[model samples]
Target chain A: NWYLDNESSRLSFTSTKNADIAEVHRFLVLHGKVDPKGLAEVEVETESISTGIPLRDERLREQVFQVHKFPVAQINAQLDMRPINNLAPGAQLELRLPLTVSLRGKSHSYNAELLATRLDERRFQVVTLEPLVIHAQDFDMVSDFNALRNAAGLSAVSLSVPVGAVLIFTA
Target chain B: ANWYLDNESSRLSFTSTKNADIAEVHRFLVLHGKVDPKGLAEVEVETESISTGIPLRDERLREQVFQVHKFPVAQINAQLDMRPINNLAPGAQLELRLPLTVSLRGKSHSYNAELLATRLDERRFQVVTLEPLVIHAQDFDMVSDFNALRNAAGLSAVSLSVPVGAVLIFTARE
Candidate 1:
């Protein structure tokens, strides 16, 4: 099994509000694994979300994520590991990973263009070629987002967010 | 000035480690910046505005690590070559190696930063640190201050090296 290194692997996203104001945020706690069957699952703890503001982080946990109920967001994908396994160290491969993100009780499919680099036989890394756009409505979180906007006293917050990830896995 | 920093959208943060294992991220709230027509970029950070979430620790950082009374601001000066991406399309990104000189507490140090510059729109762009810029306390003559902070908090040890990062948004001046 290939397990994700929680400390180095980061999941981040850009949030746009007030028409053009943008800020980046990230989750501090993440767990992932790729099993022998070629199935990969990454779970991100919602409560570990950090927006650089403690109050806002807490607000998002309570309002947007409802983390008390849904403690984590999940991403699942099926990958052909043979080619990846055989990849030479220090080599790079570009791939479009078809994955599903499960959030707030709803799941939506997304295709992520990723750059994968083989560090060694026991380690590999993957990062987004471009940000993966996520829509709040697809995950049934529009109301939650709006509530956050009102609570934060922001005029508007975009429904679509661009997400990126740097995932490192070690055997 | 050809460009102005969008303070609301710009953030500068750093991480501190204590007891060899516990790490926390903190940021300075007030930032001001500008870019000259010749691409001379400069950013000023109000050292007194450091926020560690814990009010007491915030005060300690201001007085100890930063010495806010004697040195109220920290400045970052960098020369940018903007010609290559002058016509960058919206959503396009360019990787850049930027040399930065940071002056604080009456001393200056230079660093080479790897940054990802993204064109957000016709009038706006964003620059993000591709990797954290590690700063040594001894370089800035702040080792004693860090020790004071650790002693005040009753921590056994605090790492002298800190990693800093930023997400800076710049808007074209009309």
Candidate 2:
């Protein structure tokens, strides 16, 4: 089995406000374990999520995620280990992997191109080649996500959240 | 006697360290706050929406750090020190020190913090920190359990040092 090394990994998303300023929301902790087959299902806790301001956090949780009803979100993906598991150090694997992102109770599928490195026989790092855009509506977050803007008396809040991940694993 | 400040343009941010190495940054996405004329600042943070980037960890960290299952709301309350702001003009800036009380995980901690306030216009004001107001993570824990669950993750120590800073807005009541 392979385990996630959260200490060295990053799971973040960016959002734009006003005109040009961008705010990034990131998670510091992660939970996931992969089997020998390279299949992994990772999940990030909603409460562990922070955007900096306590007030903003209050709005996102009470209105956006509805934690009492749907407390968790997860990602299911398979890591094709054949290429990099055997690659010599300094070698990389070009990957176009399909991912199934599940939130609340809905599952949405998306794809990403990745370049993973083999740091050694027991360690590996996988990162996105480019940023991934996750539609808020896909997981039924459009209404609540926008409601946050209204909470502040704003005309609107962007329904689009840009997400990306950096994962390091230890076998 | 009624008043409110629009969260039209406000943000709060904090940094977390991992592997005792990387200084990764994070934010608490949504905010609910207001400052009244008497200079009482009331800020509310939802324990549920702590967005740490990961969906599962947000839930776990909530349960582990915030203990939200029991204490749902984290509150920050302070009587603003008005001495330095008394004579400030609309375009001027004032540096004020606030003796504050922050409650989390059903417990409260007191801190003396410095804040920077600027008058955006006659009826509006903006407030933020020139430096991060620091807090220790261990202070908010109702129980010491963050270290017990991470044997396989190679997590050395959860940085107990937490610094919180924000851009807060206030408006006069009509």
Candidate 3:
């Protein structure tokens, strides 16, 4: 029998408009992951999200997250166990996994990296390494920077994002 | 009022001309309200709780100056004595004489000080020390280890430019 516990988790991203340079930002939720093994599924909540900025929190939740329609991000995975000795700190194992990312009343097949780290005899940390770079047209999001600027009487509106999460565990 | 310190450069200086007593000076001030005599409560420097951005300095201050092993704080309890002044305009600088009892190490010293008070707003005033005051390090019975460390590190004496600001708001008392 395998048991899982999430000590803390965080996700953040950064984007550059004109070029391909990406700046990364992340936030850790102090409380996350009750018991992965007890539940047949994993449901991540919206209140667990922390971006450090209040305005960004509102905009992302209202405009981007759309949690009213998509309340939780669910994950289901089968464990592939391998006994190993001497797990070093900061070492990560990458595994390719099939993932269904449900958002906006639809689910998509997205290949994700299951980054795992063994904590002790029976505990492990698992995180998802997924890059979310969807165009505004693909998600039916309005690419109306000019209109938004003109309506607000501003000269420009800049939007950039890089998103990912890190999870920790303790036995 | 908020009194912040830059432990890296700010120094609490002292000169001992006499063996029994010396006057201590602070860079900040408190103002009185319309009727209340207790102006505002200020945060005393808990030398034991010193956070100088460097762990080593904090540890040194606790051991040498503050004597956290025995005493933990250096406190100044001041009473404001306000008198009407002529030609006092709003936001103009006014002078007041107040008495303070300073407790450092383990000894207490009472002294009278001339405070340069400035009206910041209708209900707020700021006070600052005109000159650096003196306090005997031995009165607190603490070593001058910080001085030796400064000399070894090629650091100068502590010079703190702290501006103490306080606001006086009217409230009903029961």
Candidate 4:
């Protein structure tokens, strides 16, 4: 089994307001694991969102994510370990991960294209090949987003968010 | 009437690929730039100051890829419209398209870039690329240099397309 190191891992997303002003945000807390059987799971605390603005963070927690009702967001994936098992140290491979995201009592499925690197016998790393675009409507959060926009008095807020991650797993 | 880059707070990086798949990130340790009173932005990258955290790779990049002795610096110039953010306050930001002309290895190429400008205070601000700027080796006339390094390293393949990104902070010149 491989466990994620919180200090060395990062998961970030970009939010665009006013049609063009983009700001980057991240989740402070993360928990993840890749079991020996190639099953992988990552969990994020919805309340731990950091947008560099305290007010925006608070608004997102209560309005957008509704952390009281949905305290955690989880991602489940199945990784094919055959190529990884044969990969030598310092070698890298492209992986297509079928990911299911569970949040707010809903599950959305998508494929994540990633680049996996074998650092050594006991450590591995993976990074997104390209940012994954998440649409608010797909997760039934449009109303919440609208509320956030109105509360902030922003002219326009982008409905699509591009998310990226760099995770290091150690055995 | 000028904006100067804060090297300690700024980052300019690019990705390099080897063996067709293994990718690594590198940056220039020494960067200097400014936006003049006329809204003409210029960024200077010291070619010999490339840092990859690996000495061997750095040497290879400098001597073979960059040929720093012949071309010591790469310059990026752009005409910025100051009207959008001239009076931007601390909490505000603006996003706009930047058309950049890069001069490197005796060649010049034009790139269309989308950038986000965030104001931190009255005297400080930041500009970050919304998306990476893809630079092709052929466009910069570095194709032969890449092949030379690939041959020298005995690598199966080296990518010709590189993606560059930056997060640059500027402080008003005192």
Worst 10 residues of 4 chain B by lDDT: B15-24
Clash pairs of candidate 4?
none
B69, model 4: CA deviation in Å? 1.1
Stretches off by above 4 angstroms in model 3 are: A1-7, A17-42, A82-92, A127-161, B1-174
TM-score of each: 0.55, 0.49, 0.35, 0.54
Every candidate's DockQ is 0.03, 0.02, 0.01, 0.03
Ranking by lDDT: 1, 4, 2, 3
Candidate 3 CAPRI category: incorrect
Task: Estimate the TM-score for candidate 1.
Answer: 0.55
**Model 4, runs deviating above 4 Å:** A1-171
**What lDDT tens digits, residue by residue, belong to model 2 across residues B4-36?**
555544556665444432344566656677766
Over A119-157, each residue of candidate 4 has an lDDT whose tens digit, in order, gives 567777676655556767778987887788787898656
By DockQ, the candidates rank as 4, 1, 2, 3
lDDT of 4 by residue, B11-130 (tens): 687766566324456779899999987899999999999998989989998888888999999999999888777777653557789999999977999999877676656677767665
Q: Is the docking of candidate 1 incorrect, acceptable, medium or high quality?
A: incorrect
Could you tally the backbone clashes for each prediction? Answer: 0, 39, 4, 0
Which pairs clash in the backbone of model 3?
A13-A162, A14-A162, B11-B158, B11-B159
True interface contacts retained by model 2: 0.00
| CAPRI rating of model 4 | incorrect
Q: Report the TM-score of the second chain of model 3 against its true counterpart.
A: 0.54
Q: Pick by lDDT: which candidate is best?
A: 1
